[PDB]
């Protein structure tokens, strides 16, 4: 009904399987687990980086000759970003390039932009052209990147060329609205809204629907929560995991994060006497799939609580050990009292991101 596009996901389960194969870790995990079960055991650090799922799609096009690109979706950035044919860096060499001279619809803007991050540095310029996905279209100001430094095992090894922002945060000062806001402005869609539908039975797929609430994706009502930040898909919620709880937490919806995160303190209380096993030397917390002590996780707002049963926050690891599962929950300290809801939450809740109203909505996904 509304324009929907599918995107691929490389998730942390996949990357963990790759590590396991790379380093021949299966039997090690299996024997450590067997040790825990006997139970002959007990007797630090992961990176927000490592928790990133890659959400990518290849059908967005720039300019009227439809220059093809592979984009990953970024839920915090408001900009779209693409390697310039002028790009200086060796990173750019294997990538698809935007060549403004080849489009009749390009309009020069040339305002320079610069991103400086821990992970790396991006320099470029604003350029204006048609940006299409693929039902939808709008002349749009995006960053043409002229230099890319860092980001640098991922970028080269990825087939990703650029970033397509589904967030709020614009690097310009030119008040370039998000691509989805721009769509609504030029009347390509009725509302500056999109939704994420992550099908529960295909962890390598998600769907983005733009400009409308597609009823086929969900059962029951949609509950909306007000953003608690001008520029973040982030909401106030009391979080309860068993008897471990934190009031007025900050909870970011980020379907590009591969897991549920919790502060490290909070997690330690959670996992104590939950009979969950931390495999030595690996960032891998493991438990039996039927673990009868694992609680329903609760995210409570004044008028709705969002929950996740063990079934939705564990990942079977049966290709390692029968009835083994891993915890899809990672202890990580961001700002005080900040939690993120990533892929596992969104496998249960169809989610709606409403730029016009500064709301996020949730409904019980269908199994499609």
Swiss-Prot record:
Q: What is this protein called?
A: Plasmepsin III
Regulation of this protein's activity per its record:
Dimerization causes loss of catalytic activity. Inhibited by pepstatin A.
Mod. after translation: Proteolytically cleaved into the soluble active mature form by cysteine proteases in the digestive vacuole of trophozoites. Proteolysis requires an acidic environment. Transprocessing may serve as an alternate activation system.
Localization of this protein: Membrane; Vacuole lumen
Assembly with partners or alone? Probable homodimer; in the zymogen form. Monomer; in the active form. Acidification disrupts homodimerization. Component of the hemozoin formation complex (HFC) composed of falcipains FP2A and/or FP2B, plasmepsins PMII, PMIII/HAP and PMIV, heme detoxifying protein HDP and falcilysin FLN. The HFC complex is involved in hemoglobin degradation and detoxification of heme in the food vacuole during the asexual blood stage.
Question: Its family?
Answer: Belongs to the peptidase A1 family.
Query: GO molecular-function annotation terms?
Result: aspartic-type endopeptidase activity
- What role does it play? During the asexual blood stage, catalyzes the cleavage of denatured host hemoglobin (Hb) or globins. Digestion of host Hb is an essential step which provides the parasite with amino acids for protein synthesis, and regulates osmolarity.
Which species is this record about? Plasmodium falciparum (isolate HB3)
Its EC number(s)? 3.4.23.39
Q: Which residues of the full protein are shown?
A: 77 to 451 of 451
> Single GO cellular component annotation?
vacuolar lumen
